[PDB]
């Protein structure tokens, strides 16, 4: 009886592959061969945010495009001001092993999470100035790799037990689950309209979910190794994925196909961080070669190189208006490119 | 009239840096140790002689250690093992002997030892429950390890009283299995410290402490190297 289900799944995979091939009318390179490119785009370091001891795992620009947050492996959540280079708070984390941070869009809360299988949420706006923990969301059975804020009362978390979750912060209970991934899920990225989202896992696959249902809309495959970081195209009808195969890939939500692939022979390391510019023309990748690249997302040319880090660079970030490019690395040094 | 606001911000930076100095001084006096144990291998019996993560703290020779008993996590470890590349030592507990447990532990060791980020973190190997070997060999491993037939104990053997030479041979055989990987894979940046731990002996703590010494000292001797 199980062989019937295997052959049904094989026939459905064959027909969706046939549909995807039939939708393939041309190549993005074939459509953009007549474009006017921009050449090399050099960038220069502006700041250096020292004060971390251990390696930095995460950073989230604030909606005001001025503040930063950073989680390091020494137990520190440090809330930076990227303009005057001043630390605003130094939250001591109860568990030193955290792999992600998140700055709420209303600036009222900061969420961290890690190997404790618990998402902690600290209330920035307090009566004493010594910011204590507000809510500890527990229930996950695997480590937390990514987490993002929808508002001050709905947070989307990505855990290592292969299930994503949508939590209501005020009551602590998880309102929505997201099952379907076989391996654990590395990175989340909410849609620009916060009605969909997408999650890449360690199966060379990503899944487009609708938060208003809790249901897997679409499933995109085409990578060959674990998918590390994910980021939407600023429009909201595409996104980009960096994976452990040393090759970025730009997917589209409507064509349901791998649309573009960026790679180079000299690259053999993973892709620990991906983000977009304000216009969406530049694709900002952070590799394990201890240097970042910027790609021309329409012509796949290496638009430039961003060096200045010695250890691993493990997180990237572009402001909500596109005036700076902060990086957080494994040598306790945030930096800013402009 | 923004100058006084920047003054307040500078005071809030000053106090935070005065806290971060004390935290940097309490973080360098703390050495972190990742405790990895296998299925039948006694991680918790290495704990006894001394959520998704558990924390044990050590005060020895007026020095503070941290041991991370990584518990209720996922079985596939290729994504959370990269967190522990800054710890001083990976305390690697192994069994000594129903599936192929020794080969599983040896393949886990070969995997960890060859990682791109763990190529600097040293390992401290333990071979637990040698009493199990002493009561199982005197009362079979050739099917899982044929070389055990054509193996003889080295001259460097340190046989404690009461152990049959066959059990000692099996013990040092497993030790040499691990040490072949230890020597062949790396390139002189980390070192495995085998330690034939018993069922219960508190001396294990010292065997940690002293070995951490060797892990630190040689790192200091990386600056003074030439050519």
């Amino acid at each position: 009886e199980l062989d019937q289900l295997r052959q049904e799944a094989e026939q459905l995979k064959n027909q969706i592959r046939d549909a995807r091939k039939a939708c393939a009318d041309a190549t993005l390179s074939q459509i953009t061969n007549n474009i006017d490119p921009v050449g090399r785009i050099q960038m220069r370091t502006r700041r250096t945010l020292r004060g971390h001891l251990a390696k930095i795992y995460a950073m989230h620009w604030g909606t005001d495009s001025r503040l930063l947050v950073s989680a390091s492996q020494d137990g520190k959540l440090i809330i930076w001001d990227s303009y005057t280079t001043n630390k605003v708070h130094a939250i001591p984390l109860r568990s030193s092993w955290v792999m992600t941070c998140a700055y709420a869009p209303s600036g009222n809360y900061v969420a961290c999470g890690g190997l404790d299988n618990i998402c902690s949420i600290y209330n920035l706006k307090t009566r004493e100035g010594n910011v204590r923990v507000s809510r500890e969301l527990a229930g996950h059975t695997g480590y937390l790799s990514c987490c993002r804020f929808l508002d001050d009362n709905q947070i989307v978390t990505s855990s290592g037990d292969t299930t994503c979750a949508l939590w209501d912060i005020e009551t602590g209970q998880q309102t929505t689950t997201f099952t379907g991934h076989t391996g654990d899920v590395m990175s989340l990225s909410l849609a620009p309209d916060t009605r969909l989202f997408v999650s890449g896992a360690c199966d060379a696959s990503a899944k487009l979910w609708d938060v208003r249902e809790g249901m897997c809309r679409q499933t995109f495959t085409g990578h060959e190794s674990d998918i590390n970081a994910i980021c939407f195209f600023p429009n909201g009808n595409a996104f980009a994925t960096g994976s452990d195969d040393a090759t970025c890939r730009l997917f589209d939500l409507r064509a349901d196909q791998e649309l573009m692939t960026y790679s180079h022979d000299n690259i053999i390391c993973g892709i620990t961080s991906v983000s977009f510019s304000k216009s969406g023309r530049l694709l900002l990748a952070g590799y394990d070669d201890f240097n970042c690249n910027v790609w021309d997302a329409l012509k796949a040319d290496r638009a430039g190189v961003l060096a200045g880090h010695d250890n691993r660079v493990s997180c990237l970030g572009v402001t909500d208006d596109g005036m700076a490019v902060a990086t957080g690395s494994w040598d306790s040094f945030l930096k800013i490119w402009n | 009239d923004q100058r006084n606001e920047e003054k307040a911000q500078r005071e809030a930076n000053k106090k935070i840096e005065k806290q971060l100095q004390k935290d940097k001084q309490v973080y360098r006096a703390t050495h972190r140790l990742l405790l990895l144990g296998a299925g039948e291998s006694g991680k918790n019996t290495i704990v006894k002689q001394m959520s998704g993560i558990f924390e044990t703290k050590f005060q020895v020779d007026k020095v503070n250690f941290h041991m991370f008993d990584v518990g209720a996590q996922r079985d596939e470890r290729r994504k959370w093992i990269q967190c522990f590349n800054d710890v001083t030592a990976i305390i690697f507990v192994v069994a000594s002997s129903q599936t192929n447990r020794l080969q599983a532990a040896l393949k886990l060791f070969d995997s960890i030892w060859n990682n791109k980020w763990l190529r600097d973190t040293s390992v401290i190997l333990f071979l637990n429950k040698q009493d199990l070997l002493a009561e199982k060999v005197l009362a079979k491993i050739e099917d899982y390890f044929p070389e055990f037939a054509r193996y003889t104990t080295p001259e460097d053997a340190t046989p404690e009283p009461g152990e049959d030479p066959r059990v000692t041979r099996a013990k040092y055989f497993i030790r040499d299995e691990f040490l072949r990987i230890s020597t062949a894979s790396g390139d002189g940046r980390h070192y495995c410290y085998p330690h034939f731990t018993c069922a219960v002996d508190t001396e294990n703590i010292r065997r940690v402490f002293n070995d951490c010494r060797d892990i630190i000292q040689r790192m200091h001797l990386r600056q003074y190297e030439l050519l």
């Epitope: 674990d226 040393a246 | 393949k107 995997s111 030892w113 791109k116």
Partner: nanobody, 126 residues
Framework: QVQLQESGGGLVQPGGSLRLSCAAS????????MNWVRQAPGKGLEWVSD????????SYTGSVKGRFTISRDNAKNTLYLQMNSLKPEDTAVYYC?????????????????????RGQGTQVTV
């Protein structure tokens, strides 16, 4: 996608000599180490054999040293396990697993929980 399919299993008398082939499509075969593992009915997953990017670093478990043999081809992207001088211990389903990264020496692909790049297997019995 990634596809790891197998062919050659079944039932053979004690002392037979089988050859399980594994076709690996979807990815680049010239970059990933390739493993062969087994699953016994009353036992968990066990590792059987390995082979490197060029095939130089062959390995075996103690119960198959000399008996089995691993091989692979790059023009056809195929992975064979030629099993010689079998025995009733060989009754197991053989999976054709893939190392989770390119240009790496180490792999974690013997996971009881569903490993991503692991084939569906072929059952051999004696």
């Amino acid at each position: 996608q990634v596809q790891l399919q197998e062919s050659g299993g079944g039932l053979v008398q004690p002392g037979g000599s089988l050859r399980l082939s594994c076709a690996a499509s979807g990815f680049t075969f010239s970059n990933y180490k390739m493993n062969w593992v087994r699953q016994a009915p009353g036992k968990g997953l066990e590792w059987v054999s390995d082979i490197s990017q060029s095939g130089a670093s062959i390995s075996y478990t103690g119960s198959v040293k000399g008996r089995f043999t691993i091989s692979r081809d790059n023009a056809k992207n195929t992975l064979y396990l030629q099993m010689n001088s079998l025995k009733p211990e060989d009754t197991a389903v053989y999976y054709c697993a893939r190392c989770p990264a390119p240009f790496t020496r180490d792999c974690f692909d013997v996971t009881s929980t569903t490993y991503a790049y692991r084939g569906q297997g072929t059952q051999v019995t004696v």
